[PDB]
Write a protein that holds these residues in place. Structure first.
Motif, short mmCIF file in Angstrom:
data_model
loop_
_atom_site.label_atom_id
_atom_site.label_comp_id
_atom_site.label_asym_id
_atom_site.label_seq_id
_atom_site.Cartn_x
_atom_site.Cartn_y
_atom_site.Cartn_z
N UNK A 52 92.51 63.23 48.95
CA UNK A 52 91.08 62.99 48.67
C UNK A 52 90.77 63.49 47.25
N UNK A 53 91.53 64.42 46.69
CA UNK A 53 91.12 65.09 45.42
C UNK A 53 91.87 64.47 44.25
N UNK A 386 84.72 62.60 53.44
CA UNK A 386 86.17 62.53 53.62
C UNK A 386 86.70 63.77 54.36
N UNK A 602 84.05 74.80 60.48
CA UNK A 602 83.00 75.18 59.47
C UNK A 602 83.58 76.00 58.30
N UNK A 603 84.45 76.96 58.59
CA UNK A 603 85.07 77.84 57.56
C UNK A 603 86.07 77.07 56.71
N UNK A 605 85.75 73.79 56.28
CA UNK A 605 84.99 72.73 55.54
C UNK A 605 84.44 73.33 54.23
N UNK A 606 83.91 74.57 54.29
CA UNK A 606 83.40 75.26 53.08
C UNK A 606 84.54 75.44 52.07
N UNK A 608 87.21 73.50 51.80
CA UNK A 608 87.64 72.15 51.35
C UNK A 608 86.69 71.70 50.22
N UNK A 609 85.41 71.86 50.44
CA UNK A 609 84.41 71.46 49.44
C UNK A 609 84.63 72.29 48.17
N UNK A 610 84.83 73.58 48.32
CA UNK A 610 85.02 74.46 47.14
C UNK A 610 86.26 74.03 46.36
N UNK A 612 87.36 71.02 46.05
CA UNK A 612 87.26 69.57 45.69
C UNK A 612 87.03 69.42 44.17
N UNK A 613 87.36 68.25 43.56
CA UNK A 613 87.44 68.11 42.09
C UNK A 613 86.18 68.41 41.24
N UNK A 615 84.09 70.67 41.70
CA UNK A 615 83.82 72.14 41.63
C UNK A 615 84.86 72.84 40.75
#
Lengths: 628, 625
Positions: A52-53, A386, A602-603, A605-606, A608-610, A612-613, A615
């Protein structure tokens, strides 16, 4: 382990390990698949950044790299059983398509089966060592479905003993083949053979397209990527323009027909079968994500003042997902039946096999396609990210509805067989196989029991019988009005496809019903029966007019169907997590934070977002241009 | 011009120019919209590389730059009417969503309508000049549908006259708001208000999150992008975690409730309106692309000797597309009715409006969502390539079924209204408006009569409303709980809402025919209305066979007439999509282009795409012997 999932798993009604057996075929096939998976999971060579990244160019690079390594390693570890090769390739590629597919799956097997001895000497060893990488280029910009229309010509020159491969128009340009754009230095090209002044229709030619070693395009060759698609980032789907490009005569594939030095001319059932399994697998992965995530996620209220329940406790959520879970199991058993059948049949069988593989390929790909998006929507907002894994499952599965035979064309091939079967029965012949129900048409007092898979099979058989008859009579009526078979066929095509659909639906119900009787474990047989009954009753509920017409069922019986579907939801609630566990997909295969086996969404997902490209810096460079 | 599409256009029965006037509302709307689009199309500042060729990062930078330019250009051209600003924004962004959406549509209005004069003094002109960029952060990782369960707290400190904003759990973290990830330096945050030791519920707070000037996150702020999604690459959908972050008491939005300096506490319907028209538009574009492509694309044979016809000549291709083109027009007219309706009431009927808005938003987005994919598959192989423009239309429209009221929750809100109406009728009261048919709880359908068909849909809805009401009553008795019975009748309740919305669409389309002045446009709209109503019966036959609304032979006649309408629409299909007046740049489609010159343009597009920037890919290194 998330305590919700721990609870659901602890009070399941069966052992999902034994259901895994049943899906793989045996306890040893389960064990061996897991061994192949774990050897890949723990190999640093098969590891990379979250796809995804990455950009498209990087995804293509990762996939090629893995595909090169995968050939080396399978050869190293002596992996040769065709099931073991599938398990290895699937797991390496995390369910993405893999860009050496046409080289390993078409180019190589086509040489090993059709090469002359000299061809064998020039190509076998280099094709085997990936010094020669090949694809198969048939389809063109102007021509996909209708290969008779292809415009690429191969003109014999008897002065030089060469074939002149030409792309005379923009529409003639070869278009779509995987591995054509960047990966391959050879293509088997399909072309209209011209020798003397005569055309002999479609023949195959080995056409080098890039320099071995440098990969620079050969003179007269224009080759590249057809651009980005909804999915398939990993695949260099390509175009190939040939400007009167000369090849040796010895480069024509001459097993079945030949061109002499003086220019004298001498005279998809496997893939569609496999695609039924792929549809089963794609819908099973989607149901795994959505059903786990619906057991993790709490939201809204039933009882006022009580805690927010798991969203799987809402009937609307059970109705979105348990019919699809039942379908996924239905398509698992169909898949295995198509694979067993295809293996055996490999000649009063070729036509029933072609019609059946075509129809079930269309029916299962279209159903699974719709079910994957339903699973994504069932996950609410976090479904659209994603982080769900469901968008990537959908965009890499959906082309199955379009390629390897467009599904409406497939259903019409099934309809040709159903009509031919109908006409054989009305002309006094016996028909066998999945059309035997046509022998007992009333033209050539029966009450449905909604807890009996056999009685439901019977209902679905009569629905199919009625829609086959309606297509055949509407086709006959159009022939006598319009005095052209082809025109009549066009103007009946919607009824014909409805008949194929209802026929395939009946085959899926029949096969799920018969599989119940072979299940030795009683608890597994009971939960599979609940799913078989839910599958069957859901399809009645969803197509009620097809069962009300011809008096197959009554309005009060449809009311009882709807009542029973609601009750089967409530039964399948306590088993739903255990049922999707039994598929045995690893987290890396699901590519899903929401769907993760441990239910710690939840832990993760936070994190994964952090990671991600966007960020990578706190301030995007687009800030220092925005007004002030 | 592609001589096929010429021939289609020359052979049309009606003038598409005059249908465009009907769609826009007047000829003067058509002229003004086209003038606004012409103002943008002529402006090089709105041009950029094909977004299909760019990374997510590059897509975000293009979109935010175009949103900053769009604001300046609208102000330069004195564009201020809300319809013109819509026309302006939709053209510029070419379908795609825009990152200043919540700044322009929520943060700036909230400052005008709700802020104190000292708030406006701090925030308004910085915001109006884009020196402050704001968003609205309500949804959390843990909570989307049920906002009453939000975990973010705003504790009042009476000693320092401050709110303490806190995100105590991973689930509390704000999650989804557009513009929150990278664009905004301020967020209006919805939080559970605690003053003294009592919680007073959800309130809104102005929270600076980043330094003006450097855009550095402030102390106590973790803010970023939630990562890539199926679509919305252009939008920095974001998270916001606050670690006991302190803001002035004067940052609370206090138009409706106040916290005094000593801590004393004192005392979506529009966007759902809009989303109906957005569904009409996204389906109308997908039909434009697929119907034009299907008139350009030749393949396969009907008569064995003869040339390959246009694929639109195959009945299966007509069946895939014409029922969607009829649905597109149906939705265009529901959209215009919803827009006029929302306007007149929003200037007594708040119940009907909320229920109707929820229901049509869910029905139109779910239907358009299916229709867009059906259009893509109807283009075959080339449909799957971004050359079709259909994947980008789908992934950017689909979140409308999830966000702005999850569709299932919207249908249950309609069903609450239908149940309340049914109960009123059955306790001898008279209901009015879209539910007036429930008051009427020999009559054979005429399938050439939009009025007779409207009547068939009304009865289907009344039967499913009654089935839901009776099942709910039995479950209330069986379960000794209204809430459990509601849950266990929820599938029936959604089905009743679906059928009620379906009826409303048939009704509105049927009524719209009687107002069409142009005879030829009336006749072709009538063919679409009938195709729409008859397709719907054909696809839901069981709902018309049960309760004796229609017989088996009437279904056979419906199905025969649907086939005959496909033929009748065929010669008008290209002009009917041309009447939506979409420019090539708005469709973003090689296959759907207005001139039909697909193949040349396709080959250019592929050659210009990223993987072809080099003949040999860096990755060839791995493919050694």
């Amino acid at each position: 382990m998330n305590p919700d999932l721990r609870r659901e798993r602890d009070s399941a009604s069966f052992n999902p390990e034994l259901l895994t057996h049943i899906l793989d075929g045996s306890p040893e096939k389960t064990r061996r698949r897991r061994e192949i998976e774990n050897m890949i999971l723990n190999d640093p060579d098969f590891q990379h950044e979250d796809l995804n990244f990455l950009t498209r160019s990087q995804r293509y690079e990762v996939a090629v790299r893995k595909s090169a390594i995968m050939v080396k390693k399978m050869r190293e570890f002596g992996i040769a059983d065709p099931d073991e090769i599938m398990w290895f390739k699937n797991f390496v590629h995390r369910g993405r398509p893999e860009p050496l597919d046409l080289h390993l799956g078409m180019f190589l097997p086509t040489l090993l089966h059709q090469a002359t001895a000299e061809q064998q000497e020039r190509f076998f060893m280099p094709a085997w060592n990936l010094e020669i990488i090949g694809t198969y280029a048939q389809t063109e910009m102007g021509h996909g479905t209708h290969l008779r229309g292809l415009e690429t010509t191969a003109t014999y020159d008897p002065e030089t003993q060469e074939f002149i491969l030409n792309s005379p128009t923009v529409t003639s340009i070869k278009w779509w083949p995987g591995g054509l754009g960047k990966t391959s230095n050879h293509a088997i090209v399909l072309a209209q053979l011209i020798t003397k002044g005569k055309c002999y229709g479609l023949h195959a030619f080995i056409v080098p397209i890039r320099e071995i070693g440098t990969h620079k395009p050969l003179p007269g060759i224009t080759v590249g990527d057809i651009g980005p698609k909804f999915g398939y980032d990993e695949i260099d789907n390509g175009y190939l323009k040939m400007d009167n490009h000369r090849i040796p005569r010895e480069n024509m594939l001459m097993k079945y027909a030949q061109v002499k030095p003086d220019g004298t001319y001498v005279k998809m059932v496997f893939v569609r079968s496999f695609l039924v399994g792929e549809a089963a697998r794609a819908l099973s992965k989607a149901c795994t994500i959505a059903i786990r995530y619906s057991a993790v996620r709490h939201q809204s209220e039933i009882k006022p003042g009580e805690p927010e329940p798991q969203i799987l406790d809402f009937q609307t959520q059970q109705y979105k997902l348990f019919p699809l879970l039942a379908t996924a199991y239905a398509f698992q058993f169909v898949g295995a039946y198509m694979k067993e059948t295809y293996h055996r049949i490999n000649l009063s069988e070729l036509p029933e096999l072609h019609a059946l593989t075509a129809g079930l390929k269309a029916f299962t790909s279209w159903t699974a396609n719709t079910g994957i998006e339903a699973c994504r929507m069932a996950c609410g907002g976090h479904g659209y990210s994603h982080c769900s894994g469901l968008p990537n499952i959908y965009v890499n599965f959906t082309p199955s509805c379009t390629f390897e035979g467009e599904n409406t064309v497939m259903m019409l091939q099934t309809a040709r067989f159903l009509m031919k079967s109908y006409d054989q029965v009305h002309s006094g012949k016996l028909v066998c196989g999945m059309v035997s129900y046509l022998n007992d048409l009333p033209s050539q007092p029966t009450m449905v029991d909604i807890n009996s898979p056999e009685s439901l099979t019977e209902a679905y058989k009569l629905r199919a019988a009625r829609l086959v008859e309606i297509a055949a009579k509407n086709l006959q009526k159009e022939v006598i009005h319009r005095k052209s078979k082809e025109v009549a066929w066009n103007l009946t095509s919607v009824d014909l496809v409805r008949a194929s659909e209802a026929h395939c639906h009946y085959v899926v119900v029949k096969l799920f019903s018969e599989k119940l009787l072979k299940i030795q474990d009683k608890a597994i047989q009971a939960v599979l029966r609940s799913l078989c009954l839910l599958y069957s009753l859901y399809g009645i509920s969803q197509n009620a007019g097809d069962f009300l017409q011809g008096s197959i069922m009554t309005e009060p019986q449809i009311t009882q169907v709807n009542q029973r579907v609601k009750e089967l939801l409530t039964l399948i609630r306590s088993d739903a997590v255990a049922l999707v566990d039994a598929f045995d997909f690893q987290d890396v295969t699901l590519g899903s934070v929401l769907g993760r086996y441990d239910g710690n969404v939840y832990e993760n997902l936070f994190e994964w977002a952090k990671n991600s490209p966007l960020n990578k810096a706190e301030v995007h460079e687009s800030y220092k241009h925005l007004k002030s």
